[PDB]
Design a protein around this ligand. Structure first.
Ligand SMILES: Oc1c(Br)cc(Br)cc1-c1cc(C(F)(F)F)no1
Ligand SMILES: Oc1c(Br)cc(Br)cc1-c1cc(C(F)(F)F)no1
Ligand SMILES: [K+]
Ligand SMILES: [K+]
Ligand SMILES: [K+]
Ligand SMILES: [K+]
Lengths: 211, 211
């Protein structure tokens, strides 16, 4: 368990400071303090490499870097190439979610270890309906909003990339490389506080949360 | 079309002022100015009756009142009893959504007239997954977040209430009286700005929208 997890940190709105510190550094430090986390392979444009470099000697993890790709999955694959040969879990996180709780990361790590694949989620508070191509409600289910981390064993993630490669399967917002696997995905119940940061509305909320 | 629609306005966070005016009055006035709207049957506790009474002579609609019930559907039925005998559409709206645009109300009214039942919605921006009782993703759809107005012909709404009455069918968050009808429900594409107001986060966003 200890030093068993590689974080792929996916990292402009993620470098806007929140209560003075850049957004991307909040999750970076949350992961670094966890004894389970062994390395953080950070995915960022070389302009921002220094932003993480500054804190390298203080943190109790291996810092490494990767170049981003066009779409989210390209950046994950890039990060996956630098992880440890003996890492037991990869922990993929969106740097735009600075407020993830250590306790919720612990939960999804534990669930990922047990199941093979787990993602942090919350019950969708809004009333959500399926709508067909004619704009009609498909009438009838517990729907969940998916956050990050996404925690997965590296052999599973690799098999996902290889299946989509070999058969040339299409990949979208809601249908990733791992959606094509028969291997189950567990949904670990997180916190509504683990919001993503895009709008300036999010900062005015996120400061309220941090306090 | 003109003077053809009865609004049931469902109406504490809906009486917190936004840029100085109570939240419930924003939608109230939006509906009152529309030539299609004939009456606003307002659903509120008698303490707040005066809040709408003040503006009665200025508005170009019939103001009426109804007592709320325990759950949302009880308040709708209460409001439904005061509507016009010759009203062609009932337009059910949550007063906690003060920012609905006239143009979007026009759209859902037109769709409700054509289809019999229509609701304002937006594509769900979050990644939403179905999760089973064992907390596993049900792998595979266009999902939409439902707002208000909900626009429906009164005979349809009545038939919904009577079917649930007669058979004693169960009613929840996601399965209303109208979900049990075979009659189609159209989803009119609205605006992401049409947010519901509960948290103080919403006010700090809603003021940004209004400007
Ligand atoms: O789509 C997933 C689900 Br569902 C669960 C878990 Br765990 C991980 C993923 C996931 C997607 C990707 C990306 F490469 F496409 F970005 N990497 O991992
Ligand atoms: O559930 C609906 C859908 Br789906 C569409 C439309 Br249009 C209207 C409704 C609806 C629900 C109710 C309530 F009485 F339960 F509150 N009244 O109308
Ligand atoms: K190092
Ligand atoms: K190692
Ligand atoms: K009147
Ligand atoms: K009348």
């Amino acid at each position: 368990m200890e030093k068993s997890v590689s974080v792929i940190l996916l990292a402009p709105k993620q470098y806007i400071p929140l209560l003075g510190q850049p957004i991307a550094l909040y999750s970076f430090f949350t992961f670094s303090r966890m004894p389970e986390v062994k390395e953080i392979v950070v995915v960022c444009d070389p302009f921002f490499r220094d932003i993480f470099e500054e804190y390298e000697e203080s943190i109790d993890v291996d810092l490494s870097f990767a170049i981003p790709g066009k779409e989210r999955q390209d950046s994950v694959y890039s990060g996956l190439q630098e992880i440890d040969v003996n890492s037991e879990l990869v922990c993929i996180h969106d740097s735009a979610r600075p407020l993830v709780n250590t306790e919720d990361v612990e939960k999804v790590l534990k669930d990922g270890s047990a199941v093979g694949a787990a993602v942090l989620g919350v019950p969708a508070k809004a009333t959500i309906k399926e709508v067909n191509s004619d704009s009609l409600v498909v009438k009838t289910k517990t729907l969940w909003e998916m956050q990050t981390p996404q925690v997965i064993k590296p052999e599973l993630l690799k098999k996902g990339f290889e299946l989509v490669k070999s058969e040339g399967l299409e990949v979208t917002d809601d249908v990733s490389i791992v959606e094509y696997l028969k291997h189950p995905v567990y949904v670990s119940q997180g916190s509504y506080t683990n919001i993503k940061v895009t709008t300036p509305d999010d900062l005015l909320l996120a400061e309220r949360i941090l306090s």
